[PDB]
Amino acid sequence: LKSSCKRHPLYVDFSDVGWNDWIIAPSGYHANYCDGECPFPLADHLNSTNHAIVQTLVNSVNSKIPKACCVPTKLRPMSMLYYDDGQNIIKKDIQNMIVEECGCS
């Protein structure tokens, strides 16, 4: 019996992932992450897709098929200053960088 799917805090420092050279600003950001099991009773707020519900049921009677996985169901952009290949500074909103909600999919 492991914990259930939800949203956890995660600060990513760009230097820890070898990205601080091509990324000028910020030094890092709060990406968050989703972790936890997807068990039936899928909590109504597990944000489960219909297929997640089916697959979870199937796993119970057939563990060859995995349970649904706790993944981001909604993400947010984050503003970034970074080099192009010409070493010119670029301001840009990178899509799908910050987790807003998690759910079993």
Can you give the chain as a three-state secondary structure string?
CCCECEEECCEEEHHHHCCCCCEEECCEEECCEEECECCCCCCHHHCCCHHHHHHHHHHHHCCCCCCCCEEEEEEEEEEEEEECCCCCEEEEEEEEEEEEEEEEC
Contact status: 12 vs its own copies (CB under 8 A): yes
Nearer to its own copies, 43 or 69 (CB): 69
Number of residues that bind its own copies (CB under 8 A): 33
Options 81, 89, 90, 94; binder of its own copies; rule CB under 8 A? 94
Binding status of residue 70 toward its own copies by CB under 8 A = yes
Residues near its own copies (CB under 8 A): 10, 12, 16-19, 31, 33, 35, 49-51, 54-55, 57-58, 61-62, 65-66, 68-72, 75, 94-99, 105
